[PDB]
Design a protein around this nucleic acid. Structure first.
Ligand code: MG
Lengths: 112, 56, 336, 37, 71, 62, 342, 219, 232
RNA sequence: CCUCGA
């Protein structure tokens, strides 16, 4: 599970969509169908667009490239909205780690 | 978005002096001064700056 | 002969059975007795099957096979081509590498029980303990500033706007005078949250469910040692820090070898964990051994653990039979 | 041995078989990276 | 005090028993492979213990002055 | 000549050693390393490697 | 666990810059996939734990195992073979621990205050055990000056000479010391016959003590001492209170006026250059001198403003790790910067 | 300066959270006592959880189910939030059959006699028209946290998906002591919050009897 | 079966007043779960008798010296706190130490009232020079742990630190030695040195009893499942 | 060799 930082910049989002590992709505519409396998968008044009999800693909360096939808059936999506998350993205933004509760102190030499 | 220094028709590694690897004043806004490899490829592999763009 | 989809595999498990025709002269005396006794009469082969490499394991999640009997583009001479995809769920472990965004890297020394971890006044144990000695020396005080803001965004805040707008909050956008717990915020580089604005938010931190302010206006808190129960005598900075999992993980890097393949020219052990290689006891390491004056350790490393093709075998032979280790022969690389 | 002095490692006088040349080269090299202009 | 494992017996008394650390290494190693040859030729000369490596038995022998060496 | 060839400038050392029909005594540490012999230092010098170890008769009694 | 018992292994970290870059250890079977490296041999390997890896070699023959146990044993290589001084001393965390343990706090809890009128002095303790019980209530601080009856620790040179024979002191003999309970517990970690050191254990003082231990005591003794010091240093460092926060990073108050003054001087030099009187290289020289001095003065005001128990000051001045120009760059001011040409 | 036998006194805050006042205690002792209780509560309170699961058209974790929105991995992460109790002390099986469209929550699970699902609103999956989910969930009793028992150790067949088990019913424990300075004394206040699997009283009772059986050693 | 094996409790006797106790093997984390608690109980919750205050006749004004006596006041108090004593009276009880002439006063030179006892009569207290006398009164009470000398009165009444605890020093550590299938268990080592009132054994036993009662206070809320062992 | 790790 990916988790965007509490403390970020405005660069996570705009880097995640350009990186291209997220799925992005080419045209505005309504979600007709949504599985873990694909997402269909009925544009107001009357046409349909469908985006098959990369499911548990092997990246060049052995990390899991697993897309996951973040829309629901019936949702109104605009052009360029993010439909589905990628490997290190959370709701369209780059999520490279987790927010961890930290104490800054020495502890019995185990953080020596 | 990388900007590599080595290659055919470029410079070779035995010719990689210390000065091609320095942050040049002209890099401002074009090649990021922070992102570069720690090891041997330092100053040889740099990445394009945010708002930068290449002309024809 | 291909492993079945969904299997759980471990070191040395067959994934694809394969046999390579060896000549008759390559049958061992035993393999030649059983073949004659039971009259196998099938052409003699060597077990050249694809196994699971040392130190890895997982679920077979995908099989992909290409045949020459089917019309399939293969390289010349290649009849059948099959890929097995193995997936492992990797829990964070001792030796895995973590870092924040400020160049503050470290590997994991110990994963303690939740009860042993220093915990806040409400029982919440901390997740990660970063040593104080590492921060100031390395000039990445950004991690401390982040920790402070990380706590502010986790707890949420409500800036006192009653009498007006305090001087520190003057330059703050209206959408930042209050924030719900676990709020999401930006610190743009060179245009981020200034020191005064940050120190203000540490005052108006919303409390937890019991009305308690766990982190004071300095960013420090009182923690209990979960081993003794006694409190730690001074307030510790606690807060929320973004910590990434870097791709330098023990599972990839642990490697060991008693005996394995050897390069054909030199007869020395191959290199690389992937090839089940041996570690390189190099020039500066021989100087070290020499400087100690460890003559026999230096000889043994350089003859029977590497290059003496007969002494190798004689040594494994000796250990298995509980005898003394024999005398070194001549390194094959000197012959070369 | 008497001319060399104590073994810096052991603190007692240097033993007979010691390879003091390699130790000396190592002792001179090891901090060389600290040498700047 | 009373050190554990490899640091026992102490290197200092074992070095009282010999001239240099190198002589001690050879002393102990030759006695150790002597012992191991015995198990398939004299010794051991002390109570060996549960399952002790012959090198450790030999080091304890050298400590207890239970054997002699030349050069 | 073996030590010189293994140090650097190997072509030159080897050429000259050939013309001079040099014979390597194989005296040094590096040379015994290359051929896989016990180096002539530490536990490899003769006064230490040639130690005779036997038990005292007082101990052999018990 | 049976076969590996007492069978040494060699550990190596590259680059092997000197022979202590390879050291033998007794292996302890461990849970996990990582090698566990004693915190005191780090110096010898130049090993930190930011991702470093290390190599393991198994000596097979009796001679190789014997060379490993005798020549290369971790605890038999405690001194730098380059300088002859010990390398396996406490480093940074241990340091802040022991420096915390043995600092004396004027006015701390349970401090001995002499008898005034009818009130007693309430600072004397019949034994360090009694002082331990006192500190188990909130009554005695570890760092408060007190008077204790010491029974099993050797007294200083002159105290022993005056209250006994010059060289005579038996382990049973008692004596009175005005020290801290911390310095008691520190000296208890040193070897027995060692004269009581009653000082704040700066790193340099620990270095002095361990250099003395190296000169006067056998190898194994110094090894056991640094192990005990390590334990105490980690415990007390955890208990020490050193932490970084934006608040602990104090700013020098006069910094504005200092910098404005040196800017006035730089303006003088610039007007001097515009007249053609000052040379360009000479202008740069004068400006660099001005700003060197401004940096120096900012650093001085920074030191003057920091309380001497601030965790940053504590960490630097204990000798644990870091220097003050790092502190000046953090809190005061960065200063002048190099050119690509230098 | 004499002794009075100490009392434990409960004060219920919510249905799954209670405070516990133990007084009087020896000075300097409250912290250690509270912590010896908490460390046991956090670690050794018995409970029940799911061990393995089986899914109809699924042979392994890393795949999808037709018409469901969540891949099997996300479904198992959601099943990690499942809080459950059992009194059988032998592997028992729950079942989950449902056809879309609609949400699949823990209330849609049919446990056997003796197993109780405690958070029925908990979201498990989302189904559409073509979505059909058919799940078996083995429940067992244990304590602590036990990583997935492998398909090799158990004689499990390829279809079975082992799952990480969180048996602890305890959610969050803290304490505070009030120290009072001739006759000084410490009053301990434990604060225990559970997962709805059991109540603070029962968790504290199991922790207390584990500690009693363990301290009866010296006596 | 949700039941742990029975750990053992073994002894190493160092001196007549000092022992190390090993509890092993304990389920992971319990070394500390009962480590600090056992120590704090051994220190604070064992009853003993000790000196509370003293009146020294012959000096009230100076409160520094005792005429004809080598040792000063503070040293006499330090020696008196070192007196191990056991009483059955729930009320304070007074003792008297009187000895004259050049000699060496010991802890046997005191007359113990009924019920109280002095377990270290050989203890040095003071040395009286020629024409030297000593008459000093010692209040003794029952108590627990360690309470300081803090406790408007009759003149000459010096209150002292009361070392009630029969145990003197306790320190514990946790190592890892475990079963072959888990290899993460806790071995607990307790170093306890006591006075001569009780052996370390009895100290540990009474501490275990007080703790069993303490946590029975908790198991009394309800009686149902929790981890047990085959043997105690 | 390339990219990376200390
Ligand atoms: Mg490093």
């Amino acid at each position: 599970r990916s988790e965007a930082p509490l403390v970020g910049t405005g660069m996570e989002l705009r880097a995640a969509i350009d990186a291209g590992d997220v799925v992005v709505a080419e045209e505005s519409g309504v979600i007709e169908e949504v599985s873990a396998d694909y997402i269909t968008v009925m544009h107001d044009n009357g046409t349909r667009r469908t985006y098959r999800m990369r499911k548990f693909a092997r990246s060049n360096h052995g990390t899991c490239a697993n897309q996951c939808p973040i829309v629901d059936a019936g949702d109104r999506v605009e052009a360029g909205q993010v439909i589905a998350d990628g490997p290190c993205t959370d709701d369209g933004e780059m999520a490279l780690g987790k927010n961890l509760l930290v104490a800054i102190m020495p502890w019995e030499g185990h953080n020596y | 978005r990388r900007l590599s220094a080595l290659g055919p028709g470029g410079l070779s590694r035995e010719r990689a002096g210390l000065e091609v690897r320095d942050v040049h004043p002209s890099h401002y806004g074009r090649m990021c001064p922070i992102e570069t490899p720690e090891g041997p490829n330092i100053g040889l592999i740099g990445s394009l700056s945010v708002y930068a763009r290449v002309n024809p | 002969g291909i492993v079945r989809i969904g299997a759980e595999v471990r070191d040395g498990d067959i994934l694809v059975g394969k046999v390579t025709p060896k000549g008759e002269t390559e049958l061992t005396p035993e393999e030649r007795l059983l073949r004659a006794i039971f009259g196998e009469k099938a052409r003699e082969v060597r077990d050249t099957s694809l196994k699971v490499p040392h130190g890895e394991s997982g679920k077979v999640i995908g099989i992909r096979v290409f045949s020459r009997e089917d019309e399939d583009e293969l390289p010349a001479g290649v009849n059948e081509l099959v890929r097995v995809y193995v997936a492992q769920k990797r829990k964070i472990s001792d030796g895995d590498k973590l870092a924040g965004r400020h160049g503050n890297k470290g590997v994991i020394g110990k994963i303690l029980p939740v009860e042993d971890m220093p915990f806040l006044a409400d029982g919440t144990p901390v997740d990660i303990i970063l040593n104080t000695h590492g921060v100031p020396r390395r000039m990445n005080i950004g991690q401390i500033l982040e920790t402070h803001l990380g706590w502010c965004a986790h707890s949420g805040w409500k800036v006192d706007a009653a009498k007006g707008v305090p001087d520190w909050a003057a330059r703050l956008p209206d959408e930042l005078l209050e924030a719900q717990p676990n709020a999401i915020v930006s610190t743009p580089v060179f245009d981020g949250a200034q020191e005064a604005e940050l120190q203000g938010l540490l005052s108006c931190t919303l409390p937890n469910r019991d009305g308690d302010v766990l982190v004071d206006a300095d960013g420090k808190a009182m923690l209990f040692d979960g081993r003794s129960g006694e409190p730690f005598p001074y307030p510790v900075t606690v807060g929320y820090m973004y910590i990434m999992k870097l791709h330098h993980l023990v599972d990839d890097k642990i490697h060991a070898r008693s005996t394995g393949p050897y390069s054909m020219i030199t007869q020395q052990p191959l290199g690389g964990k992937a090839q089940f290689g041996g570690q390189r006891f190099g020039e500066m390491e021989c100087w070290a051994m020499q400087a100690y004056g460890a003559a026999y350790t230096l000889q043994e490393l350089l003859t029977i653990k590497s290059d003496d093709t007969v002494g190798r075998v004689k040594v494994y032979e000796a250990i298995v039979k509980g005898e003394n280790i024999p005398e070194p022969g001549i390194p094959e690389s000197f012959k070369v | 041995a008497t001319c060399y002095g104590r073994s810096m490692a052991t603190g007692k006088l240097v033993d007979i078989g010691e390879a003091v040349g390699i130790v000396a080269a190592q002792s001179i090299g090891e901090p060389g990276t600290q040498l700047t202009m | 005090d009373t050190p554990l494992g490899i640091t026992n017996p102490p290197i200092d008394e074992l070095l009282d028993r010999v001239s240099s650390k190198y002589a001690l290494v050879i002393y102990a190693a030759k006695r150790a492979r002597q012992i191991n040859d015995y198990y398939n030729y004299v010794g051991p000369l002390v109570e060996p213990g549960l399952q002790e490596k012959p090198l450790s038995i030999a080091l304890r022998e050298i400590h207890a002055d239970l054997l002699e060496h030349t050069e | 000549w073996l030590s010189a060839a293994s140090f650097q400038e190997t072509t030159r050392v080897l050429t000259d050693a050939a013309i001079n029909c040099r014979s390597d005594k194989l005296n040094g540490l590096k040379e015994n390393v290359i051929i896989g012999k016990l180096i002539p230092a530490g536990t490899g010098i003769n006064r230490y490697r040639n130690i005779a170890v036997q038990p005292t008769e007082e101990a052999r009694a018990a | 666990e049976e076969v590996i018992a007492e069978h040494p292994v060699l550990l190596n970290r590259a680059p092997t810059l000197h022979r202590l870059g390879i050291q033998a250890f007794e292996p302890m079977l461990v849970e996990g996939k990582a090698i566990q490296l004693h915190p005191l041999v780090c110096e010898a390997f130049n090993a930190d734990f930011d991702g470093d890896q290390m190599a393991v070699h198994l000596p097979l023959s009796a001679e190789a195992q014997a060379e490993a146990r005798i020549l290369m044993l971790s605890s038999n290589n405690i001194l730098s073979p380059a300088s002859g001084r010990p390398l396996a001393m406490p480093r940074l965390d241990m340091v802040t621990g022991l420096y915390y343990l043995t600092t004396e706090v004027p006015g701390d809890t349970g401090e001995y205050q002499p008898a005034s009128g009818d009130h007693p002095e309430t600072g004397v303790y019949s034994s360090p055990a009694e002082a331990i019980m006192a500190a188990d209530r909130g009554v005695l601080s570890v760092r408060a000056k007190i008077k204790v009856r010491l029974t099993q620790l050797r007294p200083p040179v002159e105290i022993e000479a005056e209250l006994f024979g010059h060289s005579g002191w038996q382990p049973g003999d008692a004596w009175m010391a005005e020290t801290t309970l911390g310095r008691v517990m520190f000296n208890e970690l040193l070897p027995l016959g060692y004269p009581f050191v009653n000082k704040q254990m700066h790193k340099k003082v620990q270095a002095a003590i361990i250099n003395d231990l190296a000169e006067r005591y056998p190898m194994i003794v110094v090894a056991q001492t640094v192990d005990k010091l390590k334990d105490a240093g980690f415990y007390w460092a955890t208990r020490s209170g050193v932490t970084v926060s934006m608040a602990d990073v104090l700013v020098p108050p006069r910094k504005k006026e200092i910098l404005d003054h040196y800017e006035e001087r730089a303006d003088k030099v610039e007007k001097q250059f515009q007249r053609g009187a000052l040379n360009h290289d000479e202008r740069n020289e004068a400006l660099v001198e001005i700003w060197k001095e401004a940096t120096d003065e900012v650093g001085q005001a920074l030191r003057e403003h920091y309380p001497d128990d601030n965790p940053i000051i504590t960490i630097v001045d204990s000798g644990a790790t870091g220097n003050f120009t790092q502190t000046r760059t953090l809190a005061g001011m960065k200063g002048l910067v190099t050119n690509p040409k230098g | 300066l004499i002794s009075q036998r100490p009392t434990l006194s409960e004060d219920v805050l919510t249905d799954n959270r209670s405070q516990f006042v133990i007084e009087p205690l020896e000075p300097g002792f409250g912290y250690t006592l509270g912590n010896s209780l908490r460390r046991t509560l956090l670690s050794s309170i018995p409970g029940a959880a799911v061990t393995s699961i089986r899914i109809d058209g699924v042979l392994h974790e890393f795949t999808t189910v037709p018409g469901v929105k969540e891949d099997v991995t996300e479904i198992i992460l959601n099943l990690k939030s499942l809080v459950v109790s059992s009194e059988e002390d032998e592997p028992v099986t729950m079942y989950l059959r449902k056809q879309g469209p609609g949400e699949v929550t823990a209330g849609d699970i049919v446990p056997p006699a003796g197993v109780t699902v405690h958070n029925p609103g908990m979201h498990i999956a989302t189904l559409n028209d073509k979505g059909k989910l058919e799940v078996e969930l083995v429940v067992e009793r244990g304590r602590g946290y036990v990583p997935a028992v492998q398909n090799r150790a158990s004689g499990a067949e390829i279809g079975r998906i082992p799952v990480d088990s969180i048996y602890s019913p305890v959610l969050k424990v803290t304490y505070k002591v009030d120290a009072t300075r001739r006759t000084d004394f410490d009053k301990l206040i434990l604060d225990v919050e559970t997962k709805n699997s059991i109540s603070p009283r029962d968790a504290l009772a199991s922790a207390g009897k584990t500690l009693v059986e363990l301290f009866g050693l010296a006596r």
